[PDB]
Ligand binder design. Structure first.
Ligand SMILES: CCOc1ccnc(CCNC(=S)Nc2ccc(Cl)cn2)c1F
Lengths: 541, 412
């Protein structure tokens, strides 16, 4: 079963040479095993067997295919691979279900043993050698003339060869979609069964005309198909419902793993929670430890189980319809979105759980989901969806027309599906007339975590607290904090904190710092707030 | 013709840059463009033995409904041996009255590329939803967007133009990449004729070389204008001082004492304060200083040229070109073009382009950009609005709040 295709040129990484590892001794039952079998290899079509020339020994042990008990040879090129050049991305990524279209019939030919049908680069075969020591001394060596299991470039090249070989059939048949993954060949179409079946054989024969033997319709695979955790049908895909085990003794690694499989699901079944399981891990001593299980912990597991019951029915992509992407805020920083063309006929759905930094706001976050979704889409449909976002046009308009950073959102449309993302506050663009004016100021001795922070108003109000164990910014912000506290619904606040300026400025509504978060609360609670910044020491005070 | 031997700078290796996902619209376009290109023998499909890769995409040109193929050889260029044989930057077009740009990418295909280097020009046309593996190619000729291309074509270029350079030594012409800048002091009348004239002169040989004007005699830099009100409040004075105190980095002559004194006490911001005659004098001096650009600013070509941009809101945007902070060589403003009524990325992009364009003119050299935007957002859409055969270097940042309020105070 040798194919007549021009081998592709394979060079070993420059400045390096073929392996030199030693063959480790084997039982006598494994020797006579690899022996009586390798003799077939050359008998097949690949002239494999050499002598003292090309001393590139490669390990060749033997392990039985437990379920047959009959030694089928095997090798290890770990070294060779190391010494072989690099090829190009073999599968930059797998096709996601929501991007396939529906078909009348799909088949997959298990072109399994195809690697061995393709001719290896002759000038390279050389760098492939065996060593099957009988039993005693005598200090039985083969090579390769065809792509072998384990070699770095076997798949890469194979795919390509396949690619070339299919090009014609693909053209004479632009109504039949083929898909190559690993050693399988997915084929779909909207032909009437009988027609499909014949093209399939037509093709099956076409491959064989190249030396690629394939299975007859009597021994093939049939839908539904197992994908990325998706159960596939030619008309629909479904989420292979997976249920969590009922455990007597819960271990650390157990939770670690349970919580993982749990998170995966959350994308499909938004409603899943794990905050209370994420808590059984705090302080964990060893991976094999057995943690109790809070009641709040079981109420979650049990409540999650209810959810992961009824599976998920989904439909494929119709190029004819426009793409709709709708989002919702599960909570602070947690978003759920779902793409579809026919309402409720969900194509794809998801959840993003963004963290937090020295400054972020729901609006900005919203923005980040949109960009992700967009990209995701381009990748799957080559198009970007029309968005349905829970923000009011006025809200957006007034925000981005003020943010310091460049930002945009593709064609989108408001959807009053509370809770709506909104601006929790806005600093006044100028001093509020008829308002107290606090001149907050804070200082702390860098090395000795200790300082003071206070204020003084135009109404002659004053205050200063000493702070044991702190830094510069904590105090600054604190000063500000204070001002806000004992101040009233309308306050003007001068401060010289360079860092603080930006922070508050950018209307952040969530931070890492509990202190900053303090400030936010206050800021929200106020009627109107003007915040002003003035240069450092000497002058304004 | 033949082909001169090219190499990578020693030690370096071919770029292995990942292709970003493209929209369908673009994908089909490219596929169409590349098959045709293959037929002509300008490019060839390649195998996996080739591990290299560069990004490509398509952008429609201004006033054109035709998709143009664009590649990002930035990395490759970074790695190809500098040629030293370079291009001489004039200084005239800087001063000229009007300039026009010609796209001479086609000329580059005529000439072939060294066979041992072709491998490095590998690129990949992606498939939607990773349904099929990529369609990989590599150039056979001199590709567009490569630094070597104008270089290896330089000679041929000279003679091509000589008959015009000799017939009109009163007009300037600069070549940079697939671009060609030509400036004349002649009115847009006798000008267009001479450009469309020169245009033909080229079409002659065979290399299709097709608002669209420029005016370098209207941009160089602007002053920082200080407010000037009738009555000044505490806040007003404060802000004012903040700016100056910062400006004192560009002008050390700037004083801010007299003003700062008035600001002594714990007065309400809305409080109105009468200006000290001493203070009024001080301010007068600062106003005077700021009137013109700081002294001692020389363009050193030994060092890179930098470009910062501050979003100022209201479609407004500000920039400064410099090789050393606070010693800008030029600074300017840019008001969005009627179309980006709701698109920040569109604007930014446009901006970026003018600025680079200008650099070329002034110093014939692209600047590295400090863009106030997320890497994510930028890479998702910059391609959707780009329109230039070249691609400047860039990095994303956080606009320091001071610098903006500052240049915001630019001659309006
Ligand atoms: C099990 C899915 O295998 C495949 C993966 C990727 N691509 C193909 C061919 C393309 N087929 C298309 S557009 N639709 C499609 C729909 C349903 C099913 Cl079950 C398989 N393919 C496949 F057949």
């Amino acid at each position: 079963p040798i194919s007549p295709i021009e081998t592709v040129p394979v060079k070993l990484k420059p400045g390096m040479d073929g392996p030199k590892v030693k063959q480790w001794p084997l039982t006598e039952e494994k020797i006579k095993a690899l022996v009586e079998i390798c003799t077939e290899m050359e008998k097949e079509g690949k002239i494999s067997k050499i002598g003292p020339e090309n001393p590139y020994n490669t390990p060749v042990f033997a392990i039985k295919k437990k379920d047959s008990t009959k030694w089928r040879k095997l090798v290890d090129f770990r070294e060779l691979n190391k010494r072989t050049q690099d090829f190009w991305e073999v599968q930059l990524g797998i096709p996601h279900p929501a991007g396939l279209k529906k078909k009348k019939s799909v088949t997959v030919l298990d072109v399994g043993d195809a690697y061995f049908s393709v001719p290896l680069d002759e000038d390279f075969r050389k760098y492939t050698a065996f060593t099957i020591p009988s039993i005693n001394n005598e200090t039985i060596r083969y090579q390769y003339n065809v792509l072998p299991q384990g070699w770095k470039g076997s798949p890469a090249i194979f795919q390509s060869s396949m690619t070339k070989i299919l090009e014609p059939f693909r053209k004479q048949n632009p109504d039949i979609v083929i898909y190559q993954y690993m050693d399988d060949l997915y084929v779909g179409s909207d032909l009437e069964i009988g027609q499909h079946r014949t093209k399939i054989e037509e093709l099956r024969q076409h491959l064989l005309r190249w030396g690629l033997t394939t299975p007859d319709k009597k021994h093939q695979k049939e839908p539904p198909f197992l994908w990325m955790g998706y159960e596939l049908h030619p008309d629909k895909w479904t989420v292979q419902p997976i249920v969590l085990p009922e455990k007597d003794s819960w271990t650390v690694n157990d939770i670690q793993k349970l919580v993982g499989k749990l998170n995966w699901a959350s994308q499909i079944y938004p409603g899943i929670k794990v905050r209370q399981l994420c808590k059984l891990l705090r302080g964990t001593k060893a991976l094999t430890e057995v943690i109790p299980l809070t009641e709040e912990a079981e109420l979650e597991l049990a409540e999650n189980r209810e959810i992961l019951k009824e599976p998920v029915h989904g439909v494929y992509y119709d190029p004819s319809k426009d793409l709709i992407a709708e989002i919702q805020k599960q909570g602070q920083g947690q978003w759920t979105y779902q793409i579809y063309q026919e309402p409720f006929k969900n194509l794809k759905t998801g959840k993003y759980a963004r963290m937090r930094g020295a400054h972020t706001n729901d609006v900005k976050q919203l923005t980040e989901a949109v960009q992700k979704i967009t990209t995701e889409s381009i990748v799957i449909w080559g198009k970007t969806p029309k968005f349905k976002l829970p923000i009011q046009k006025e809200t957006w308009e007034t925000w981005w027309t003020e943010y310091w950073q460049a930002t945009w959102i593709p064609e989108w449309e408001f959807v009053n599906t509370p809770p709506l993302v909104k601006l929790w506050y806005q600093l006044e663009k100028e001093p509020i007339v008829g308002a107290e004016t606090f001149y907050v100021d804070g200082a702390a001795n860098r090395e000795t975590k200790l300082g003071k922070a206070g204020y003084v108003t135009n109404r002659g109000r004053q205050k200063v607290v000493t702070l044991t164990d702190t830094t510069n910014q904590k105090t600054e912000l604190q000063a500000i904090y204070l001002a806000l506290q004992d101040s009233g619904l309308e306050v003007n606040i001068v401060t010289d904190s360079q860092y603080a300026l930006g922070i508050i400025q950018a209307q952040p509504d969530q931070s890492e710092s509990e202190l900053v978060n303090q400030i936010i609360e206050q800021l929200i609670k106020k009627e109107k707030v003007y915040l002003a910044w003035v240069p450092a020491h000497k002058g304004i005070g | 013709i033949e082909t001169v031997p090219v190499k990578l700078k020693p030690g370096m290796d071919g770029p292995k840059v990942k292709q970003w996902p493209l929209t369908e619209e673009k994908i089909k376009a490219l596929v169409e463009i590349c098959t045709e290109m293959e037929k002509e023998g300008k490019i060839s499909k390649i195998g996996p033995e080739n591990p290299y890769n560069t990004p490509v995409f398509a952008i429609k040109k201004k006033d054109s409904t035709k998709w143009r193929k664009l590649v990002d050889f930035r990395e490759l260029n970074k790695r190809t041996q500098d040629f030293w044989l370079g291009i001489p930057h004039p200084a005239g077009l800087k001063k000229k009255k009007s300039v026009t740009v010609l796209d001479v990418g086609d000329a580059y295909f005529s000439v072939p590329l060294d066979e041992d280097f072709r491998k490095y020009t590998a690129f990949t046309i992606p498939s939607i939803n990773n349904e099929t593996p990529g369609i990989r190619y590599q150039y056979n000729v001199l590709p567009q967007g490569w630094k070597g291309s104008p270089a290896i074509f330089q000679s041929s270029m000279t003679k091509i133009l000589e008959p015009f350079r000799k017939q009109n030594p009163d007009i300037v012409i600069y070549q940079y990449m697939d671009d060609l800048y030509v400036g004349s002091d002649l009115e847009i009348g006798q000008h267009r004729t001479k450009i469309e004239e020169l245009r033909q002169h080229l079409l002659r040989w065979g290399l299709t070389t097709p608002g669209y004007e420029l005016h370098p005699d209207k941009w160089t830099v602007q002053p920082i204008v200080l407010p000037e009100k009738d009555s000044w409040t505490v806040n007003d004075i404060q802000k004012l001082v903040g700016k100056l105190n910062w400006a004192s980095q560009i002008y050390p002559g700037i004083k801010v004492r007299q003003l700062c004194k008035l600001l002594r006490g714990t007065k309400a911001l809305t409080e109105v304060i009468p200006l000290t005659e001493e203070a009024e004098l001080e301010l007068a001096e600062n106003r005077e200083i700021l009137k013109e650009p700081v002294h001692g600013v020389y363009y050193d070509p030994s060092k890179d040229l930098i470009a910062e941009i501050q979003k100022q809101g209201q479609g407004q945007w500000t920039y400064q070109i410099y090789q050393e902070p606070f010693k800008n060589l030029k600074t300017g403003k840019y008001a969005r073009m009627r179309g980006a009524h709701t698109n920040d990325v569109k604007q930014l992009t446009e901006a970026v382009q003018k600025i680079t364009t200008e650099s070329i003119v002034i110093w014939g050299k692209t600047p590295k950009f400090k863009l106030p935007i997320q890497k994510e957002t930028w890479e998702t859409w910059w391609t959707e609005y780009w329109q230039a055969t070249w691609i400047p270097e860039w990095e994303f940042v956080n606009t320091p709040p001071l610098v903006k309020l500052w240049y915001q105070l630019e001659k309006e």
